[PDB]
Every structure is written in structure tokens, then in C-alpha cells.
């Protein structure tokens, strides 16, 4: 394999899982013991960027859905968005900055800072069923901490 990739699940620190809110958008909500298969499996690739040791650059894409979380400027504000790419060319170890997030692990607690837009992380609201977005205040009240579960089974 040209790039190192692992399949994971992700749940925020408030225990909310993430799901598709209509292809091209994601949302976090707590799922009932029956709908647990509604959660998106990611393909976290270890892309090369600024390996700072306390950070590890990654690419987050929807499994076999050919979609990659990227960060772009939308209205002069850093924003999260899902964009499709070419399945043959992707995933690459040399990823364009927009799809690049630095995976920071504090107390077994994951944050994903945007390499493109530092001080802006993958966030979720305390609210149930709201979309997954890029948040800039970090601790404004919005959740920027997550947990990862590997799909080894």
C-alpha cells in the first residue's frame, strides 16, 4: 500500500456518534442500540505534512464512499465540507492542505486541528443531531474532543 491507512469510527467526548446527514454533510447524535450501523466508518490515512511529534497529520475520508473531509474558506471563514475525489488517485500520502488535519492526543482524547486553518478543529454541538463542522473557539462550548474505535472487527 502506498499510504498507511486504518479504519476507525469516532465518537465525540459527549458520546455522540457521527452519521451521514444526506451525502455531503455529517452529523453527531447519540444512536440507539439498533441504529448503531448508521455510523460512518472512516479511512484515516497518515499523510505527510508537518510531523511535529506531538501532532500527526492525517486525511479523513468516508470508507468506500470516495469522500474526504476538507477545509476551505467559505465566506472568509474557515469551514468544513465533504468533497468527492477520484478513487484511483486517492488516498495519497501527499495530500493537499485542505484535507489535512493534525491528530493531537492529550488524555487519550483526540482533537483534529486543521493544517490549512490552524486554531480551527473538527467540532460538534452539545445539541443532538446537528452537523459536524469546523469550529474556531475550541472551548467556546463546542466539542473538539473525540474517541476512536478501530474497525479490526
Amino acid at each position: 500500500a502506498p499510504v498507511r491507512s486504518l479504519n476507525c469510527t469516532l465518537r465525540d467526548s459527549q458520546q455522540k456518534s457521527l452519521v451521514m446527514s444526506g451525502p455531503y454533510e455529517l452529523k453527531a447524535l447519540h444512536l440507539q442500540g439498533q441504529d448503531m450501523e448508521q455510523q460512518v466508518v472512516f479511512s484515516m490515512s497518515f499523510v505527510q505534512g508537518e510531523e511535529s511529534n506531538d501532532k500527526i497529520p492525517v486525511a479523513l475520508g468516508l470508507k468506500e464512499k470516495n469522500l474526504y473531509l476538507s477545509c476551505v474558506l467559505k465566506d472568509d471563514k474557515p469551514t468544513l465540507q465533504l468533497e468527492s475525489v477520484d478513487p484511483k488517485n486517492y488516498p495519497k500520502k501527499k495530500m493537499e492542505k485542505r484535507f489535512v488535519f493534525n491528530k493531537i492526543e492529550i488524555n487519550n482524547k483526540l482533537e483534529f486541528e486543521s493544517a490549512q486553518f490552524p486554531n480551527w478543529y473538527i467540532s460538534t454541538s452539545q445539541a443532538e443531531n446537528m452537523p459536524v463542522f469546523l469550529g474556531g473557539t475550541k472551548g467556546g462550548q463546542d466539542i473538539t474532543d473525540f474517541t476512536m474505535q478501530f474497525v479490526s472487527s
Binding site: 499510504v3 459527549q14 447519540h30 440507539q32 511529534n53 487519550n108 443532538e128
Partner: protein, 310 residues
Amino acid sequence: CKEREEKIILVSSANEIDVRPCPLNPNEHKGTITWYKDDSKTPVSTEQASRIHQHKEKLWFVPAKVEDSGHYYCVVRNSSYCLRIKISAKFVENEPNLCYNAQAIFKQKLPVAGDGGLVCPYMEFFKNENNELPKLQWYKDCKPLLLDNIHFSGVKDRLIVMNVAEKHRGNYTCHASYTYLGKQYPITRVIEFITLEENKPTRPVIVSPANETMEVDLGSQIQLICNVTGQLSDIAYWKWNGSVIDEDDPVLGEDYYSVENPANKRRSTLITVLNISEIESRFYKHPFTCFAKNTHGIDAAYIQLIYPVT
């Protein structure tokens, strides 16, 4: 108008209040919101006192029964883009002897040997009591938990389980009492608590590029292999002369592999192959270093290429 879906059915319990606002993505707008009955009827009442009714852009149930367990709608059309959202709710009765129905559990997990938090879902509406989430009472297997700050702590919508153990597994319930129109109704959520294995931090072990030298002919091609013994979330990569191997490099190229050890996953092997198509003059000056990395620190080991001995 067109149509909108929403396949996830939220199963709330009958005998208590319940609200169901419509899922509005980035675009909401406050002047479009309206609910409808089963098989498209009229706007499910509009009086705060009636039972099944719509208030501040939300479909409240006052005491909610099992008969309410059905398909509802909501319509957004501010200017013209009408598509009317389908909901589909379900109300259940507590199973015999239990203080809950498993049809309504939310699966939540926490790793052993460390302080974690279980979260009482959908408390976002009942919050409004002057923007103060109600005082939650917690139970596991229908018995009450003492929130002493030794074994458990209750803060807002969460239950801090101190030093999670296998013995914390079970079905938990959080209880609140929401005052709606002077009359206070009850509220419960069940959480099936599943413990995860403790996450012990361990630096990976580079097995093969153990700081040595290798004789190579100046023209040929070779394969350098880095063998690491650690977890699968541990990575292994090459860097040569202070720099990573570029994907668009014409002579250097990596090939990554992993093999999980069935007997002990913390002792699985990462294999990273470096293919040098043509050994150049420069590769004899600086060594090819291999890095084993994870959040708890890196590991290094090199292979210094040298010309053969005459």
C-alpha cells in the same frame, strides 16, 4: 413541494414528555416551521394546553402514549422550496419489572481503570428551565447511585464513573422532572454501559533497521525493510538525510504493510519497504533512518549505505 426522509427513529418512552424538532441543517430560518398529523392532516394543534401539539417550532407530547407511535411531518417553505419532512416516532412501555425498555437504550462505552462520563441523551429541550439542565438522578439496573464524588459524580447531563471497572457494566438510567405549564412531568433515558479494555501507552519496538551499515554497488537497486513490533495504530516510515520520502520521488518509494498478532495485538508487526531503484552517490553520505511513532514518542534506527570492500 417535493419530499425529505429521516430514517433514524428515536424511540422515547410513553408516560413522559417528549419534543421533536425538525432536522434543519445549515439553513433553518424562523418563519416556516409547521407540524402535521399521520397520513397528512391538519397542523397538530397549536394550543400549549392540548396534548399532541406544536409550540416554539417543536412537537411536544405532554404525557405521550403508545398510540402516538406513528409517522408525522413538518414543512419548510420560506420563499417556495417546500419539501415537507417525514419523521416517524415510536413510544414504548417499560418492560415487565424493569424501569425501562431495551428498545430505547443508547449504547455507551468507557475504558477500564480511568474516570469517564456517560451522557444522558436528548436533554437539550428540557434544559430550558431558565437555561438550566434539570437535576438528574442516576440509577444502574433500576437501583439508585450515590453521587458522592468518590464512586460517581453528576454534572449537568453526565455521569462521571470513577475508575471504570468490568463491574460498572449494566443499564443505567438518568431521571429528570420538567416543569411545563406549572405541571412537572418526568423524563428518563437508558444507557447500556459497555467497558473497553484499558488503553496502556507503549512505545513501538524497531526490530530491523538497528543502526548498522550495508555494502551496496553504486549503480544497482535495493530494498530496505523496516520491521516494527507494536500496535497497529503505531506507524513506521523512512526519512533520509533529514527528509521524508516524497510520493513524487523518482528513485525512492515506500510500500506500507501491517499484520495483526492474534495472540497479542500490542505485539503486531508494521512493515515498511523502501525501494531504491538506482543507488546514487549521495546515499553513501547520510543514513536512511526508520521511525516508529505514536502519541507517546518516537523511535529511531538507521541503515548507512557504504561501498563494497575491495
